[PDB]
Symmetry: D2
């Protein structure tokens, strides 16, 4: 036995309980007693290796992306999904130079645009991507997708009104048409869309990601809405950036009982370890704790739920035996901490989640001397 974690509280997302037991690690697998290394996790909660489902981590190919193996592991994140940073032109290089050598397990959505989001970033000198259906290379998209079905979960398209404010057709209608023909899912930046929520939501199906559901910049999900709630119960999964979160939509929607199925960060160089809006995934989870979301439901939105969407159920996002030894050891801390949205509205919280140790593929990649 290579590592043992003793004296901790395991969060059992299945039953909403805290289990008093040790974790066993041999190789890169959690197993079911002497151990070469013993971790003392007293007062800590043992979580599965966290999964940030909407990030941008094609560093070197874009200006906005960060290296997840450098900034995410120390805050408990061991797996990520890239939200269409790459397109068919640069996906293979993204896979060969980032995904394959990274320790953070990275999945991805292929962007409709061929170069992805490489044009945004670097400040205001950056420019928006070209979402014109006239420049969709369907032959290359299908080729990239079919040769990489084990890493690309779907197609990513950003549908903000400003990206197209004179195209041949509507970028959504054309994308969703491609997605259906290619038998795959879609993920849509919906902030400031040309259509209203009651109209866009008719284009989504079981497995598709309606991202930044709580944005409220333009047509929000509030008049809440009944077609969105129907789509959520049909199988449509529902990313705080610097502009894609509004407290008024979030407080209202959750007051009415609507909850996001996935919590993400839209992690960028601009909002990594730096704002009161994103900072880290833990910071984003901590806001939902102080916004009334139940703890075991926050944990589900960053472990079990995305790990099924990445088609990795039982492999990650769980502390079961035979799972990858991806463990995040956190302590819930009581301190005054402020959360901000797009409009500048603040919320003063009483607690935040602080990561004290990270184990990735059975290796101690992060461990404070004293938790």
């Amino acid at each position: 036995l290579d590592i043992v974690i003793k004296n901790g509280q395991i969060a059992d997302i299945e039953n909403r309980t805290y289990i008093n037991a040790d974790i066993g690690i041999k190789g890169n697998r959690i197993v079911d007693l002497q151990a070469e290394t013993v971790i003392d996790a007293s007062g800590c909660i043992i979580l599965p290796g966290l999964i940030d489902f909407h990030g941008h981590v094609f560093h070197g190919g874009t200006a906005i992306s960060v290296n997840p193996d450098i900034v995410c592991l120390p805050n408990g994140v061991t797996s990520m999904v890239d939200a269409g940073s790459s397109g068919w032109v640069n996906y293979s290089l993204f896979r060969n130079s980032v995904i394959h050598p990274a320790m953070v397990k990275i999945k991805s959505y292929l962007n409709v645009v061929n170069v992805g989001l490489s044009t945004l970033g670097g400040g205001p000198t950056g420019y928006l991507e070209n979402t014109n259906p006239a420049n969709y290379n369907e032959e290359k998209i299908a080729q990239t997708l079919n040769d990489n079905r084990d890493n690309i979960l779907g197609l990513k398209l950003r549908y903000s009104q400003d990206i197209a404010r004179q195209y041949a057709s509507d970028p959504l209608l054309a994308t969703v048409a491609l997605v259906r023909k290619l038998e795959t899912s879609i993920c849509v930046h919906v902030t400031d869309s040309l259509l209203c929520a009651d109209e866009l939501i008719r284009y989504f199906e079981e497995g598709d990601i309606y991202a930044h559901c709580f944005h409220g910049t333009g047509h929000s999900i509030l008049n809440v809405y009944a077609a969105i709630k129907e789509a959520q119960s049909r199988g449509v999964i529902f990313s705080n950036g610097v502009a894609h979160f509004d407290f008024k939509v979030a407080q209202s929607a959750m007051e009415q009982g609507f909850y996001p199925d996935i919590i993400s960060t839209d992690l960028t160089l601009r909002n990594s370890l730096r704002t009161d809006k994103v900072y880290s995934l833990l910071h984003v989870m901590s806001k939902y704790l102080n916004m009334g979301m139940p703890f075991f439901d926050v944990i589900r939105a960053v472990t079990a739920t995305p790990a099924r969407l990445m088609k990795m159920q039982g492999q990650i996002g769980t502390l079961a035996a035979n799972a990858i030894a991806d463990i995040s050891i956190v302590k819930l801390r009581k301190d005054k901490i402020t959360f901000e949205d797009t409009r500048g509205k603040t919320l003063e919280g009483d607690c935040y989640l602080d990561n004290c140790a990270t184990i990735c593929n059975g290796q101690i990649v992060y461990r404070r001397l004293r938790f």
Copy 2:
């Protein structure tokens, strides 16, 4: 002191004396040794021995762009051992291009850094591709300056293609950045808003006027059909002129008119892309473009010079490559001049039937035999 490779019985091309030398070349390691007996002996009987050719305008950011090729795959078997990427990458994707292509590659690649954020990553799929954004409103100077300063051992300057409602002029803004950051420029300058008489006034010694024989819009010829005075004056000062025979950057009428008036390119290159590599009758390879110029009345030792010594100078590598002299890097291309009817095409469709073509039979790169026909 035991030699590693000897190429014997070949005709060595001395570009400086414009003559051939009948002697053997010695190689120990990755260096050329003076043989004024080895592990491996190559018989260049009936062959001309060139230094490793240098393609000065190719696009070789494979993986990061849609138009590039891999030089290690398609360029070594046709004699080319060094290359310069003409702005495939911008400040966003350069360091990836240098880490994932340049550093692992064998073909020595120097580069020009495009001013656009993403370089030329945006064109390529065919009709679905689209042109790059040269808006000076999107020039990240602090990023361009950071990329240039941290990689002055590789970036020779900035590339711009000069052919929406921008803020400034791309060429004026770029030359301003180029001059401010104290480096050189390279301009596509095909279908330009200004006549060649005006545009050339901003070029300096070591700058690159690319696609000089393009003949699509304002060419290097006046309405009388003669090479502009300032164009000739520019080359006298030190401005470099490069043909880069693309699929739409070469016209027969302009090229034929310039060389009869005594205007010969300083650089012969290809604008090599996956579309024009080993495929067309316009930019088939560097040897195909060189062969086009032999069949055009360009002296042999001038065509070689335009792909060996002139580029090796502009990449700040005099004596290291582009030559077969002692202590040079062992980049050797062994060729035969073969006689056969071969047709060259231009952007307009005009055709020229030629008599011969250059044919590579062997390539030594960094002292290693990377291409060697069994019988030359």
Copy 3:
């Protein structure tokens, strides 16, 4: 779109040539007005050639070559690396060589932790350590399972000189075979100067395993004391044991090969044992085309040479139908070769020469539907 016109297809199954045109769309062959037309008049149109024992972990080993550079011009588009990498460096080999390369590369994982990284630079190189006491069974198992799509088994080099003197714990062959059996995989073994006789040796091999350097003729060959192929060697080939004539610089003997082919024993795989020392350099190995041309001038039928570098290894690489064939929907890996007439000498390990009269000369190479080598006139 590429169409290759006026060519001759080799049919390894029906052992005849066929005048037909090959069609390319995307990266796959289709069943036949194209963007690019290639005049292959007076040419044999082969599948992309497959070199089964090469050493291609460049950057990590001193002996390896970059297959994208030196192999594609000679018709080879797929290769298998005969154990240059061990469990220590396989992932680096896969990420820095295999994934970005254009030549499709499967591999055998060396049983030694670091592989053959110590075996180059000339005489200063030294033999790898095949002591079973230094096998990391857990790391070998881990590397195999997390990469079962690219690793076809374990590679062992089993010369007397490797273990001679160095007092190893157990016998490397018995240990590596035991591990290969326990791990439900296959083995590939350098057999040159093996301690055991071929009749004894071959009793450890099973269907799908590789007997590398079958014509090595240094020590215990596949010939008995009267010059005949052992009946056990012959029975093993029938069971499924794949015999491979890896033409090293010291792994081929004309007297053993000629005898074996006189008695009807033909190697199932023709390969090079390609290293930076024997690539484009010698008279023993030079290219895959060179080694095949030796067997052509040695009496082996052409359609059986072609199969031993196409259909057979593609099956062992578990890629049947995608490569090693020109059938529709296979990957567009195409080699255009010409049968050239010229005096050519082939040398073996001891210096025995054979003056042949023909060799195969590659003229154009298609890889993943892309022209990557094309003589302007061939």
Copy 4:
């Protein structure tokens, strides 16, 4: 201004004082704001150090078994620049450079190991084996080709000179030292369990050469028969021979360290011998900050510990003024630490333990002008 760190305390290594001051970062450089941003870091009650420098780490991950990725495990504990102590040799250096050094955020210099494969054979448990240091296998043409084509990164040659390694044709130290001198560079030597004595072995060291594991006490230590530091050792530090304590799991003796410091011999450089086995794990090595804390609790002044991990290593990497300093126009490599009071155990090779009452804890890390680690509450 991009980043300013308010309310901290720089540590002046020259004047041996602490100054409450602010740090300004623009782009990737520390700017001078001494006479008056986009992000403000509250460093209340923290010591503002430069990015720490670990001088003997093993970070050729992928190509070795003992190496860690410094980008993952070293940045969050304050390290932004490292030197690899001969994990790679001439065979695998360029792959080490292209696949780790070039793409890494941590700035990694290196020493080339005289062994061809470096330390790739080490680790993975007891199944690993010692590298081959026989001078008969030194490839001097390749070592010289590698160094001279990579002199901006290779600071010298590394040899591990223990008896258990060579227990050969010539003495590896004598041969290595000679090669170093002929090649005109510096050397670095694991001086643990060596054949020669400390006074005898030090006579081969010039200025800029590293005497690794100076406090090892395993076999021949820097202490004579009377428990006193050798005069020739003391004379060498005067000349400019750098003594690095490293540490690791077997190269640190508490008796030797305590004696040699009681007589005024303090190590010029403090490092870890960081490996996959001693990273974040033992009570011996754990991190640089853990090792520095052991030296803090051992009676070493704070400015000397900080110097031995800031200025002194940055000098031997030929990078004075770019890293290891907070001066204006240095690389924006900042470490923000607190000196926590707590009961912490320190262990040495032989098991001897020393209980301390403090240790350094890293709360934020800035690398090349980017926040790569920042606790929400320091």
